[PDB]
Ligand binder design. Structure first.
Ligand code: CA
Ligand code: CA
Ligand code: CA
Ligand code: CA
Lengths: 617, 43, 158, 540, 136
């Protein structure tokens, strides 16, 4: 029914006919649904012109107000006192601050003209013919009566229908018209598959959404189409195999793309945690649990982490009440780690609530987890008791003085120190030199948070026993090497020969590379905080390092350990013969023509250490 | 947006998901009915 | 009708050991033994309980906020959700939660004896009803079964 | 020197921050310019007056069988009669029961009452008092947006204490022996609200590191207090005009299988509000600078606490003896114990500011709306009645906080007598509106009445403006007017206890306590005597 | 583009850089916005990254930083106009309150003269034009 037909059809019903006659009940019901279609395309026309004025208006707005603001900040700058902060706002808030005060610039006449057109025919007749029907013709069939007054109320409130129209529309370019269509063709396939293999068409349907260039570029659009609720009620309908997972993997990608998407996905957490139907692991189902959607909903944003409350964490430890035999219990404590920490520093509210609910039912641990360390003919307990420890390390009060200058952050810290002994050195030093790399770093991050330099020498022969000597043994040993570069940083804060034995083994291990320089950064400050007789003895290996220096592994070790030996030469304020070659072999590099401009300034401290202290094998 | 109304305009620059159809033949390409609908004569 | 401040009260459970209704009560000695134990009452017609060392006098009842500001440096009516300072009626010492570890299954069951130091949150016990019928904020009547939770250790009177 | 070179880096460290921050000015995407333009155009510029159209529309449906309006109400009743163990959304209902509720100087003051009573005749002639009485009994306890829309209709029908509608609500309940309505009203108040502070300090810490908050007011106060106000206001309108057949119907609920004592069930509610604002006092009690969110969480909590006292009165107002007796055995007294304890401590710290007057008026008013209640509870006393005996019994059980408020009124009433003495007026000025502080420290002291402690409290702020004096008229208008109306009811209540219940001795403590009050209002209160409906005589 | 201002922007990058591995995290930006008086949170730091995050590494790389300054933003020529309010190069004892108002640091009451007196050439009681060419 293109342009010729509707003139035949409307002027069949208009003339001002079909509508004027007397009709029975189940036909005028059919006409009412027809009459709703005309007003619906009227609404469609109003939005199509409200985007038409918009493109020309912001072309007048942006080309004025961005351009004229550039005139002000070259004629006034003074980085940001006052006039910057009026234009320093959120881009959403900038839009309301620009136009939306015009109901108290030069273009204030134009947009005020448009609202006069969008004040507002057939509105007269529909308001007339619904009255003429309902008056004389006392109506049964409540499926009709509901249908009548909708068209009456929608007529008198055409504004309010447009109020619920604008938070669905969206504007894009002619570039996107390719990938948007087969997006919508797939999305309509999922909405059609809502009522019913049935599995495989959804999996074919969902993945083709997931490879679209217009799927990341407009996550406001994907939110405005409501296609999170679309796939969720499919999954709601399925639950009481792979049909559950392959939609569930889409939700985890759905929250990762933006923060404002993740707020909309927060409101379904109540139902979502009631699914202990998947927690029997069987990877690679460990990227697709309904728990994993609950993970990515809270995963990062601290605003979302503070908003959730105590019945949510009640049900999770109610499931941990069920784990009294297991393997499912490791994934619950995986979730609560995203309930207390969320940024690198813990929250202070949820961290209190979970441990109080973790004392009301309790479940030596290092006496028990040592016995299974040679159990063979298992590991799911070895990560579990690692996980419960990894949780409790996160809900520490503060490395700041909130632990110090406050009560009520000690009361709970007293609980943490009481439930465990020191104890863990079963898992820290002893067994962890054989499973190895995942659990020793987990026990460190408990002990650092809850509990000076006497245990520095007491807890040596640690880490670099097997690892720093096996640099050519590379494969789980190789997977452990880059892992404990950063874990051994926080031990920044007699046996120093054995420490120098591991440090030279670390120097052979430092002979990934950003983290290998990070373990060097925990090493370069280590000799600065050193009785200095070991620091003078470590400088003897620095001359042994200077022999293998004058490649890049020693080039960072050249200029750093030279001034650090002068920091070790504060104690003078024997082996200066090798130091004479150390200035000579450096001068042997000086006549050879990198970072050598760093080591050249390290030569004057080598005479100043002699001016302060001395006054492949 | 305005006449100096008629909902039978022909501009319609929305997205409007397209029609596709299939002819009910009897070829041995049996995984190709399979897509849209049986066809029909329109006008 | 209402338990008030400065009335001698006792604290007793009725736990059963193989269907034998042991109506044990909490007692303590002091003056040479800084610990508490039990006193039996079920064989009252043969062995009467030594009630000189079982009775306790309530000395104070505060809101938790009033306690927290008070540590920061007439008969009243006792209310739920209040911290109380229990006093042993004979020995004069106050019931507390000692920070030691003895006579237990040795997991985290702290020790309960009786000390002298009024200050510090070790000697304050909050009262929580064992009833959804009577609730927070209202007066505790005669015979109301309840829970005592420490302020310091936050452990129940187990 | 070294600090001269230290500003050169902090110039460039700060000037680069501005180029990090001012780089977003809607520049490169023309889509994000236009897509954000619409959402801002919506939430600013649609949102206007269409609202002449209701009263024409219901006029257009109350026209000449069966009316067109009469079928519309008949649709909603027959929808609400079938058991589906739940309601619906029904956005038809959510708009039409809104439009049906949107359509509702002596002679004008009666003619406005006249044409209002015609406009509720437009609806309740056609069973509109039944779709409100059924959509409540349909939803069993759910506080959804449906049942919040029916209460806005039932309020806008009963709005004047309409007597015919209050007769139709009862005689519908009597024949259709409905348990499911009073089962629903008790469950509606069962959760309904409370101002919780653990959501506030969560947000207050989130005001620390959540910098801008757009609409985080949701869990803040009482979870949509506007529904919670509109529940009890619908309960108050069911009893204004003293339907003693209906105030006794809310109590014992005779002709049914089970009974719901709804009158105790609203006592149990405001006790949960009493503790809710006491805890919002105790947390607050030491900061003494109310920020913006501290104001608008009292003001959204005072009005609901103001409202629940107004409907508490209407169950008692007509002297129904079985109703006020059955509330005196309940736990009413703990609420008015606690509400006094908020009144003194806040007023001493709220009357120290020029910004905190807006909270002061509301908290003064709730003090009045409390004593307007326990005036009305007292009115069936004889001489030494029990309900008069218990009302003084709570007066000693919070005796220590009655002191401060009675002391607070004396500070602003004895100022109101010393206004035209010329050692108050012509002492430091002739007359200008400027006196002093230093002479005000001693011109007040040469009136000899007050202690020095009260003169400094009167010297709280009093201008905070460039002069080290105060202002004559503005201070006395804040002295006279906001504490002479509220102070009058406290004078009546102290009068009402002594004359009705004499022969108490600790009551003579309270009488000679506030003797400066009772000798200020005694030229304003009249004590007449009538024959009030019990065939006795009671003072008025 | 003139590499003088680009070398100045490298100096500004190293002023922002604290870990010194070529990439700038969010925490350096949060500390530098907290050290200059302002109070940012994680949300502002995060989306201010996400605007500049075209490289998609969560960090500030160098050439995108360079063109981001070349968008809007000499350096010390615009800074000398903060000194020269009077236009004769003098920054007097009376004019010193007009220079140091919009910095952030609370200026002292006796050490402020020692900053001049060590730096002043002959003792004209001001901070002249010659304390900018050979003082910075
Ligand atoms: Ca960095
Ligand atoms: Ca980067
Ligand atoms: Ca001058
Ligand atoms: Ca000079």
């Amino acid at each position: 029914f293109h342009n010729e037909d509707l003139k035949h059809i409307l002027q069949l019903i208009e003339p001002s006919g079909l509508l004027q006659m007397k009709l029975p009940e189940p036909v005028k019901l059919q006409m009412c649904l027809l009459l709703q279609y005309l007003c619906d395309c009227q609404v469609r026309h109003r939005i199509e012109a409200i985007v038409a004025f918009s493109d020309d208006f912001v072309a007048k707005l942006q080309d004025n107000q961005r351009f004229r603001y550039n005139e002000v900040m070259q004629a006034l700058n003074c980085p940001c006192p006052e006039e910057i902060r009026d234009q320093l706002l959120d881009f959403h808030e900038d839009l309301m601050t620009h136009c939306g005060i015009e109901l108290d610039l030069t273009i204030r006449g134009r947009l005020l003209s448009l609202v006069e057109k969008v004040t507002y025919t057939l509105q007269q007749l529909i308001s007339e013919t619904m009255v003429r029907w309902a008056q004389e013709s006392v109506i049964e069939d409540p499926e009709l009566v509901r249908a009548m007054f909708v068209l009456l109320h929608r007529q008198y409130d055409g504004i309010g229908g447009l109020v619920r129209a604008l938070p669905k529309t969206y504007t894009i370019n002619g570039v996107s018209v390719e990938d948007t269509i087969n997006l919508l063709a797939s999305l309509g396939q999922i909405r059609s598959l809502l009522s019913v293999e049935e599995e495989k068409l959804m999996i074919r349907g969902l993945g083709d959404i997931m490879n679209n260039k217009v799927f990341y570029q407009h996550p406001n659009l994907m939110r405005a189409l409501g296609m999170h609720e679309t796939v969720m009620e499919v999954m709601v309908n399925v639950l009481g195999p792979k049909m559950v997972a392959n939609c569930c993997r889409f939700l985890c990608y759905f929250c990762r793309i933006s923060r404002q998407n993740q707020k909309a996905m927060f409101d379904h957490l109540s139902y979502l945690l009631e699914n202990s139907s998947v927690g029997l692991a069987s990877p690679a189902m460990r990227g697709s649990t309904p728990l994993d959607v609950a993970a990515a909903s809270v995963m990062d944003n601290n605003e979302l982490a503070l908003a959730l409350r105590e019945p949510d964490l009640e049900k999770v430890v109610r499931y941990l009440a069920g784990c009294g035999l297991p393997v499912e219990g490791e994934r619950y404590l995986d979730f609560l780690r995203f309930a207390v920490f969320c940024n690198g520093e813990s929250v202070e509210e949820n961290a209190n609530v979970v441990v109080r609910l973790l004392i009301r039912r309790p479940e030596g641990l290092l006496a028990a987890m040592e016995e299974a360390i040679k159990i063979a003919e298992g590991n799911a307990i070895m990560t579990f008791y690692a996980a419960l420890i990894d949780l409790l390390g996160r809900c520490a009060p503060e490395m700041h003085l909130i632990h110090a200058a406050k009560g009520e952050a000690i009361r709970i810290r007293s609980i943490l120190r009481s439930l465990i002994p020191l104890g863990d050195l079963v898992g820290v030093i002893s067994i962890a030199f054989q499973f190895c790399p995942d659990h020793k770093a987990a026990m460190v991050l408990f002990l650092d948070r809850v509990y000076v330099q006497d245990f520095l020498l007491h807890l040596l022969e640690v880490g670099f026993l097997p690892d720093l000597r096996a640099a050519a043994s590379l494969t789980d040993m190789a997977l452990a090497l880059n892992r404990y570069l950063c874990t051994a940083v926080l031990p920044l804060l007699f046996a120093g020969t054995e420490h120098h034995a591991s440090l030279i083994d670390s120097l052979l291990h430092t002979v990934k590379g950003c983290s290998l320089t990070k373990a060097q950064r925990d090493s370069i400050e280590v000799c600065l905080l050193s009785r200095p007789s070991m620091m003078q003895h470590l400088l003897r290996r620095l001359v042994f390092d200077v022999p293998l220096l004058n490649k890049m592994p020693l080039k960072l070790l050249t200029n750093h350990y030279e001034r650090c030996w002068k920091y070790y030469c504060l104690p003078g304020g024997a082996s200066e013969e090798e130091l004479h070659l150390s200035r000579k072999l450096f001068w042997g590099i000086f006549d050879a023509l990198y970072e050598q401009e760093l080591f050249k300034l390290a030569l004057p401290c080598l005479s100043a250490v002699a001016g302060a202290l001395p006054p492949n094998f | 947006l305005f006449p100096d109304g008629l909902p039978g305009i022909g501009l319609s620059t929305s997205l409007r998901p397209r029609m596709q159809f299939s002819s009910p033949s009897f070829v041995s390409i049996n995984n190709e009915c399979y897509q849209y609908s049986p066809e029909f004569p329109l006008d | 009708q209402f338990l008030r401040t400065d009335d001698e009260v006792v604290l007793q459970c009725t736990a059963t050991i193989h269907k034998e209704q042991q109506k044990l009560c909490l007692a303590a000695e002091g003056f040479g033994n800084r610990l508490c134990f039990l006193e039996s009452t079920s064989n009252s017609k043969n062995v009467p309980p030594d009630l000189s060392i079982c009775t306790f006098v309530l000395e104070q009842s505060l809101s938790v906020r009033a306690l927290q500001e008070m540590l920061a440096n007439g008969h009243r009516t006792l209310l739920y959700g209040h911290a109380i300072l229990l006093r042993h009626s004979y020995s004069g010492m106050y019931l507390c939660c000692l920070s030691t570890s003895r006579s237990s299954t040795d997991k985290l069951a702290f020790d309960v004896g009786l000390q002298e130091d009024t200050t510090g949150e070790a000697c304050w016990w909050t009262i929580h009803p064992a009833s959804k019928q009577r609730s927070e904020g209202e007066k505790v009547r005669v015979g109301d079964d309840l829970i005592l939770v420490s302020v310091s250790s936050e452990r129940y009177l187990h | 020197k070294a600090v001269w070179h230290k500003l050169l880096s902090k110039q460039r460290k700060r000037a680069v921050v501005a180029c990090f921050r001012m780089a977003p000015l809607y520049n490169l995407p023309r889509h994000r310019a236009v897509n954000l333009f619409l959402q801002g155009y919506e939430k600013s510029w649609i949102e206007t007056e269409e609202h002449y159209f209701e009263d024409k529309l219901i006029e257009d449906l109350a026209k000449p069988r069966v009316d067109p309006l009469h079928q519309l109400i008949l649709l909603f009743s027959r929808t609400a009669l079938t058991e589906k163990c739940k309601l619906e959304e029904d956005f038809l209902y959510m708009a039409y029961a809104d439009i049906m509720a949107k359509s509702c100087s002596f002679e004008e003051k009666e003619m406005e009452k006249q044409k209002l009573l015609y406009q509720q005749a437009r609806l309740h002639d056609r069973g509109a008092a039944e779709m409100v009485l059924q959509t409540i009994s349909a939803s069993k306890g759910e506080t959804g947006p449906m049942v919040a829309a029916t209460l806005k209709l039932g309020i806008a029908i009963l709005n004047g204490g309409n007597s015919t509608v209050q007769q139709k609500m009862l005689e519908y309940l009597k024949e259709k022996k409905d348990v499911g309505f009073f089962q629903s009203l008790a469950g509606l108040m069962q959760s309904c609200s409370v101002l919780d502070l653990n959501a506030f300090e969560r947000q207050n810490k989130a005001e620390g590191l959540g910098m801008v908050t757009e609409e985080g007011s949701g869990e803040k106060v009482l979870q949509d207090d506007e529904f919670t106000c509109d529940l009890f206001r619908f309960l108050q309108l069911l009893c204004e005009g003293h339907n003693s057949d209906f105030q006794n119907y809310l109590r014992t609920q005779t002709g049914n299988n089970t009974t719901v004592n709804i009158i105790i069930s609203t006592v149990d509610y405001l006790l949960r509000v009493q503790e809710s604002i006491s805890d919002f006092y105790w947390y607050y009690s030491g900061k003494d600078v109310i920020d913006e969110q501290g104001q608008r969480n009292f003001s959204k909590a005072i009005q609901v606490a103001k409202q629940v006292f107004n409907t508490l009165t209407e169950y008692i107002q007509g002297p129904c003896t079985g109703n006020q007796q059955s509330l005196a055995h309940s736990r009413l007294w703990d609420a008015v114990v606690g509400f006094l304890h908020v009144f003194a401590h806040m007023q001493m710290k709220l009357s120290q500011d020029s910004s905190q007057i807006e909270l002061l008026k509301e908290l003064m008013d709730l003090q009045k709306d409390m004593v307007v209640m326990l005036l009305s509870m007292l009115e069936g006393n004889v001489v030494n009645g029990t309900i008069g005996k218990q009302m003084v019994d709570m007066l000693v059980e919070s005796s220590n906080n009655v002191e401060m408020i009675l002391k607070f009124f004396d500070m602003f009433l004895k100022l109101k007598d010393l206004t035209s003495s010329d050692t108050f007026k012509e002492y430091d000025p002739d007359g200008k509106g400027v006196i002093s502080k230093r002479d005000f420290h001693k011109a007040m002291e040469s009136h000899k009445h007050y202690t020095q402690s009260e003169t400094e409290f009167l010297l709280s702020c009093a201008e905070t403006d460039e002069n080290e004096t105060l202002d004559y008229e503005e201070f006395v208008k804040r002295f006279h007017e906001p504490a002479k109306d509220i102070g009058f009811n406290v004078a009546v209540l102290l009068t009402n206890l002594s004359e009705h219940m004499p022969n108490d001795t600790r009551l003579q403590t309270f009488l000679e306590l506030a003797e400066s009050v009772l000798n200020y209002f005694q030229p304003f209160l009249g004590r007449i005597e009538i024959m009030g409906s019990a065939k006795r005589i009671e003072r008025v | 583009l003139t590499e003088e201002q680009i070398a100045e922007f490298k100096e500004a990058f190293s002023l922002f850089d604290k870990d010194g591995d070529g990439t700038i995290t969010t925490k350096e930006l949060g500390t530098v916005m907290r050290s200059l008086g302002q109070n940012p949170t994680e949300a502002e730091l995060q989306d201010m990254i996400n605007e500049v995050d075209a490289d998609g590494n969560g960090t500030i790389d160098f050439p995108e930083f360079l063109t981001m300054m070349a968008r809007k933003m000499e350096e010390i020529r615009e800074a000398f106009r903060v000194f020269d309010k009077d236009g004769n190069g003098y920054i007097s004892a009376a004019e010193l309150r007009h220079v140091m108002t919009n910095l952030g640091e609370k200026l002292t009451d006796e050490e402020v003269d020692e900053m001049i007196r060590e730096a002043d050439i002959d003792g004209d009681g001001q901070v002249n034009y010659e304390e900018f060419v050979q003082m910075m």
